[PDB]
């Protein structure tokens, strides 16, 4: 990977984790 | 959220986790 691609993938990793956390918060709020 | 939205977002969570793992594998393969 180029340095640019490496940087992009590290940023994508953090963003995927943030999206997971947001989804988890929404799902956990759905009281039955 | 509707039950359908709960199901959909749970599936999106699974996909995000898989994509994150694939990106991590690519990052861990890098070399100086
Ligand atoms: Cl949370």
Numbering used by the authors:
A (entry chain A), B (entry chain B): 1 to 32
Paper's wording?
Here, we probe the mechanism of oligomerization of a peptide representing the CCD of the STIL protein, a tetrameric multi-domain protein that is over-expressed in several cancers and associated with metastatic spread. STIL tetramerization is mediated both by an intrinsically disordered domain (STIL400–700) and a structured CCD (STIL CCD718–749). The STIL protein plays a highly important role in mitosis by regulating centrosomal duplication. The CCD of STIL is necessary for its self-association.
